[PDB]
Swiss-Prot record, chain A:
Localization of this protein: Cytoplasm
PROSITE patterns: RIBOSOMAL_S19E (PS00628)
Something else known: Present with 29000 molecules/cell in log phase SD medium.
Originating gene: RPS19A
Chief localization: cytoplasm
Keywords, comma-separated and alphabetical: Cytoplasm, Ribonucleoprotein, Ribosomal protein, Ribosome biogenesis
Protein name stated in the entry: Small ribosomal subunit protein eS19A
Effect recorded for residue 14 to F: Partial loss of function; decreased 18S rRNA, decreases binding to 20S pre-rRNA complex, slow growth in double RPS19A/RPS19B mutant
Subunit structure: Component of the small ribosomal subunit (SSU). Mature yeast ribosomes consist of a small (40S) and a large (60S) subunit. The 40S small subunit contains 1 molecule of ribosomal RNA (18S rRNA) and 33 different proteins (encoded by 57 genes). The large 60S subunit contains 3 rRNA molecules (25S, 5.8S and 5S rRNA) and 46 different proteins (encoded by 81 genes).
InterPro entries referenced in this protein's UniProt entry, alphabetically: Ribosomal_eS19, Ribosomal_eS19_CS, WH-like_DNA-bd_sf, WH_DNA-bd_sf
Originating organism: Saccharomyces cerevisiae (strain ATCC 204508 / S288c) (Baker's yeast)
Family: Belongs to the eukaryotic ribosomal protein eS19 family.
From Swiss-Prot, chain E:
Residue ranges that the Swiss-Prot or TrEMBL entry lists as coiled coil: none
UniProt-recorded name of the protein: Small ribosomal subunit protein uS9A
Residue span of region Disordered: 121-141
Subcellular location: Cytoplasm
Self-association state and partner proteins as the record states: Component of the small ribosomal subunit (SSU). Mature yeast ribosomes consist of a small (40S) and a large (60S) subunit. The 40S small subunit contains 1 molecule of ribosomal RNA (18S rRNA) and 33 different proteins (encoded by 57 genes). The large 60S subunit contains 3 rRNA molecules (25S, 5.8S and 5S rRNA) and 46 different proteins (encoded by 81 genes).
Gene Ontology BP term (one): translational initiation
UniProt gene name: RPS16A
GO molecular function, one term: structural constituent of ribosome
Family the UniProt entry places it in: Belongs to the universal ribosomal protein uS9 family.
Keywords in alphabetical order: Acetylation, Cytoplasm, Isopeptide bond, Phosphoprotein, Ribonucleoprotein, Ribosomal protein, Ubl conjugation
Swiss-Prot record, chain F:
Quaternary structure annotation from Swiss-Prot or TrEMBL: Component of the small ribosomal subunit (SSU). Mature yeast ribosomes consist of a small (40S) and a large (60S) subunit. The 40S small subunit contains 1 molecule of ribosomal RNA (18S rRNA) and 33 different proteins (encoded by 57 genes). The large 60S subunit contains 3 rRNA molecules (25S, 5.8S and 5S rRNA) and 46 different proteins (encoded by 81 genes).
Name of the featured protein: Small ribosomal subunit protein uS10
Encoding gene per record: RPS20
Signal peptide boundaries: none
Domain of life: Eukaryota
PTM characteristics: N-terminally acetylated by acetyltransferase NatA. Also partially acetylated by NatC.
Protein's organism: Saccharomyces cerevisiae (strain ATCC 204508 / S288c)
Parent-record interval covered: 62 to 121 of 121
Swiss-Prot record, chain G:
Organism encoding this protein: Saccharomyces cerevisiae (strain ATCC 204508 / S288c) (Baker's yeast)
GO cellular component, as recorded: cytosol; cytosolic small ribosomal subunit
Single GO molecular function: structural constituent of ribosome
Identification of the protein by name: Small ribosomal subunit protein eS28A
Post-translational modification: N-terminally acetylated by acetyltransferase NatB.
Gene designation per UniProt: RPS28A
InterPro entries: NA-bd_OB-fold (IPR012340), Ribosomal_eS28 (IPR000289), Ribosomal_eS28_CS (IPR028626)
Amino acid sequence: PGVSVRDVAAQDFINAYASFLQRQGKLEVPGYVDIVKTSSGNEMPPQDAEGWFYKRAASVARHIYMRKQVGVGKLNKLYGGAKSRGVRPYKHIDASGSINRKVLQALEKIGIVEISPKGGRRISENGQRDLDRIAAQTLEEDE
Amino acid sequence: SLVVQEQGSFQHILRLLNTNVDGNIKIVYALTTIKGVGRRYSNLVCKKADVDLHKRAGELTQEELERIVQIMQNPTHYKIPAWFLNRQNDITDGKDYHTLANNVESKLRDDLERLKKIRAHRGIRHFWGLRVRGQHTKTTGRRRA
Amino acid sequence: AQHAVILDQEKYDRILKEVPTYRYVSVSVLVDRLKIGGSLARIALRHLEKEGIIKPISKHSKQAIYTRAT
Amino acid sequence: GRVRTKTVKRASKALIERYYPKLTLDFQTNKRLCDEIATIQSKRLRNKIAGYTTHLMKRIQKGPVRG
Amino acid sequence: AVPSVQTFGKKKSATAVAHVKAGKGLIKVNGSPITLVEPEILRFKVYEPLLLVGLDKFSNIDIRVRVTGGGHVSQVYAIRQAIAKGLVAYHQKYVDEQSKNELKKAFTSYDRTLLIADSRRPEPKKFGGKGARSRFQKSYR
Amino acid sequence: VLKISTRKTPNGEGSKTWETYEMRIHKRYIDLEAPVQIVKRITQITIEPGVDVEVVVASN
Amino acid sequence: TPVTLAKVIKVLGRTGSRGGVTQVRVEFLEDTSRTIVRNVKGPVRENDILVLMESEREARRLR
Amino acid sequence: FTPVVLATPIPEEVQQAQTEIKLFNKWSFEEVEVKDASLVDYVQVRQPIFVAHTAGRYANKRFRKAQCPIIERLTNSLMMNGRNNGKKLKAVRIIKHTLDIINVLTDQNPIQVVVDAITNTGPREDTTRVRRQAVDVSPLRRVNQAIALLTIGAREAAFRNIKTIAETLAEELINAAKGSSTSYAIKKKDELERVAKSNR
Amino acid sequence: GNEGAIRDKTAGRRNNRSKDVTDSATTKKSNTRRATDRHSRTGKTDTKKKVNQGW
Amino acid sequence: PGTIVLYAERVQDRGLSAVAQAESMKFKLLNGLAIRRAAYGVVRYVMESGAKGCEVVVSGKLRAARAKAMKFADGFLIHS
RNA sequence: UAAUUGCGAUAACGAACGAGACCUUAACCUACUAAAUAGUGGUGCUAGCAUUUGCUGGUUAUCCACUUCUUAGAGGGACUAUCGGUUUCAAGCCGAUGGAAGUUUGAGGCAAUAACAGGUCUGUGAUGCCCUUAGACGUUCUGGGCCGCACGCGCGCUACACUGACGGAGCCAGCGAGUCUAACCUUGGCCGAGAGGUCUUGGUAAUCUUGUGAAACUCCGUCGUGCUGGGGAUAGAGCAUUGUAAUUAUUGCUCUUCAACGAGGAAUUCCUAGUAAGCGCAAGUCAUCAGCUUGCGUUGAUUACGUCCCUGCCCUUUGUACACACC
Ligand SMILES: [Mg+2]
Ligand SMILES: [Mg+2]
Ligand SMILES: [Mg+2]
Ligand SMILES: [Mg+2]
Ligand SMILES: [Mg+2]
Ligand SMILES: [Mg+2]
Ligand SMILES: [Mg+2]
Ligand SMILES: [Mg+2]
Ligand SMILES: [Mg+2]
Ligand SMILES: [Mg+2]
Ligand SMILES: [Mg+2]
Ligand SMILES: [Mg+2]
Ligand SMILES: [Mg+2]
Ligand SMILES: [Mg+2]
Ligand SMILES: [Mg+2]
Ligand SMILES: [Mg+2]
Ligand SMILES: [Mg+2]
Ligand SMILES: [Mg+2]
Ligand SMILES: [Mg+2]
Ligand SMILES: [Mg+2]
Ligand SMILES: [Mg+2]
Ligand SMILES: [Mg+2]
């Protein structure tokens, strides 16, 4: 038929890419993932705790692919949410600027993103291959 | 997850660190009933000590909990960041410590009494039992002293 | 912190013969019987689903509705 | 709650007074007529005037009317 | 160049501009299929045009839309409405009238803003209270 | 739209009544195809007290 | 539980001090042609139907 | 059912719920009927609707509120207490669930047990501050009040308790299908009319 | 000084909570000079054959 | 120097530009005219000066501790 | 009738101010004018999956055409239209159809005559008079204070949770602003858990910051009714930024400490449709500081569409010795 990323259900697609990046082996985790709650705007770290770098590493590329170019700042703002300033009103603050910078770096070394001109990081070509075949198996879930 | 069944493994009551712990509660949260503990400080140490937080607080292997206690009593020698604790550059030995259970209650007064002994304004404030961080006291904090 | 939020070895017998005769099932339906706390209750449902106990008339989380094995 | 002001009623009465051969009972024609027969100052104003002019012209062909 | 039109839909500040080409009967808003949007429970509100007029009704057209502004429900209400007049304008130019009148009547008899360009808008707040009609609390000494 | 919201009373008494002032700006641009001598004949009266006429050419 | 069936034919007006109640003449379509005047609490229109539980009673203007 | 195919995949479930007799996303809309002469013409149904989310102005004119799909007007009565003002979608999901439940045990289609629940919670008569005076409430304040009492009671039960809002609402309306002396609505209604006698 | 502020007793929420509230706390406006407004207190008037010369 | 120069332009029908008349009222009452005399003079000047309507108000005190306020208007005048 | 808005009665007839008109904003134009500082289709050039020709992107101009979407100029459009119901069958009102729109179309702007010892000499180099003027009440510098805390009142912010907090994940607005003698709005690359730092860049702006990827909300999990993970006051220890200066802690982050608060007495506020309410955002303020305000959009109800009982205010009639007008 010919599959594409837009033709897959976001949640069960990114989670599939997560289970794949998970059982592949080349990760390049910065090693510091025991603590960070992914933003100051949040209260506690993600619950997966063996992984979830892959889940963020699925959301890392789905987004950057659907868009021409993006930047670490834009990703912080995207994932960042409302931060309970205790007794003060809720406000939205950007997420971590490093767990994002090196969530890309760690997989650019794995070649799924390229440092785009104009500033930013465009979707990779071999990544443009590491594309929708993944969606093919996704659809295989409903074969 | 996945359903499990312990024969008699899990003991409900368990006191350690001179602090009680509920058996029927999860071990990543059951630990936080001690002083100087945190829902994050405990989270980290748990798999730093290689425990699976998915289940309750008592099934836990005895040796596993002694390893944990060691981790907290020796957190920097066992790869814990120097900005994750409440006692960095403590005040007299440029050391980075963590105050736990019975010792935090003490350290609080250690610092308090220092402030008083040195006559710092915030020390005077505390002795008088007022607010130290400079908040407006006119309309706030009126009936609990 | 009350009434066996944990395994309850001789309760694992109760669950199996308890599920029949029910037209509804849910985490609430479980703790509703002087039983296992929600954390370890919510997790049992699919464990039973594995072999002909229920019929999953519901779809998503925060609400689950299975039914008598047919 | 729209009771036309007497400015409009005034002008419309003064018009049934001089343009009966003209001013057919359908609004659109009366509007296009006033655009050339009266010095009105606003579209909506002349629409109100014309719509009234039409209602008056509509019922006098049923009976009489004051003024 | 093939027979095709362009229409739109507007709910709140949302805008859904749609193009319909004479084709294989493929439909996808923003580049993804209509299979899933998720305002999931609200997806049937856009599945409705298909089933209302009889669902085949697409074997020689092509639907795809983009939506700016609005919100998670503003756009979902604006796009269904952006496709309804898409199909009507198509039967206006390329197809006969009778079939079109049939469609616009089958729509008008069910339509929830399907063809009516909902006029509601946000009212502007006035000093005296953070809200359109609400006023700050009073004291009376 | 240049808005200016301010209280009407010079003092702070009475009803806390606000007032929004406005100033509307219009800047229209054209790209022309003219010669080297009509360069300043459009600088002659094409003026109207109150319009800012700015013209320079470039592609870089 | 003997019930009734009354259909309003004309509307009377707003009774009661606050004005939230309304007098209305009702009409039973079971043994029709009869007269009865009851008062309501909710908002009503012409032609609605209500059911009386005590058919032999009728209040009047309320203070 | 004369299936039709195209390029994008439209699931056969969807390919089944079309012009073929109209149901809810999964519940039949015909055969639902008011079993009480009163409130007929005031319980809008058939006018089938697959999901209760309709951006229809129901207050621009007084009585058009009666032409609104009842299950929807019933759903609008959940986005209450500020904490829920808005949250329409979260509500819509709670209702699709709720009926996923009323039918859990009651075989009777949910779009019918709903009418059965509204029937037994409309106070035939009430009282007003003259002592008090016996007064017959209108056929639409009848419904409005029925929906209001049913939802406040279910919302009352869902608070401080594990049971979900959908479960409490389902059990409340099942008891209200034909009063069983247990729904907060049967109780309140019966006692809002047991005092209309106090003034007679 | 600071030593005096701490050593010095009579200070502290304790030493104040032990005491009673001056009833002047719950006092009000007192409406001073809001009922005599219309009666000019200047003890002076304006001559009519002064105003007529002015206006 | 040369970036600007100003030239004086006599004003047509001064009796229609408000400021022109207000300054006159000022510069006559400052010379000692009767308040009513000067006010009525400027209002009828403005009338014989074409303007379809005119009005002048004087507020404040003139030899009387209490401040008064008098209006002087003639012709037609719109305010909404 | 919203209206001294009109119908009608009429010793009055015909007019004017004010209401209306008018102006502005939001809604409607596939009809006019056309725009690489807006965008659409084709086509070059180009990337992936499938392959049958499809499906999804890249490309500051590769070219060709257009103005639906965007923008703002000119027109048009509604006048409560048509039909009916009601009524002195009058002004009008009510229902239905049609309609972008039929609640003054929604929202504002403007707004006469008079009245107050209403507030403002602490906005004014507006000002009368009085006070002071070299040990100054002028003025500047240094430090403190306006925050001071047994209590009383008022506008508010966060909550007491399971229509939830939490953790991933899906991810959509609209009003604005923004740096020259300059340090304003900031993309992107690295370093940092964070706050933040550092290296460059676009922008005097529909061109760059920005699709402001906001928040609620949607989805999938972890929790389990127990002050619980709800809740985040108080408090210790450290790291940052603004600033000549942060002590009485400007603000930010990290860890730890884990109160009251289990729906609120007597009372009282605001509100009728994209309104209430929840939700966040821009602007004013601003070196730093919003729990404030002015606007914005986001999700979006319940219940009225009545009356004069409460309350307030108007209007007649009436009494009056008040007219400096019941102070
Ligand atoms: Mg977000
Ligand atoms: Mg998120
Ligand atoms: Mg909070
Ligand atoms: Mg603790
Ligand atoms: Mg909240
Ligand atoms: Mg006028
Ligand atoms: Mg256009
Ligand atoms: Mg209609
Ligand atoms: Mg005074
Ligand atoms: Mg002044
Ligand atoms: Mg002065
Ligand atoms: Mg102050
Ligand atoms: Mg206030
Ligand atoms: Mg969440
Ligand atoms: Mg570090
Ligand atoms: Mg530059
Ligand atoms: Mg707790
Ligand atoms: Mg918390
Ligand atoms: Mg309450
Ligand atoms: Mg600010
Ligand atoms: Mg302020
Ligand atoms: Mg008299």
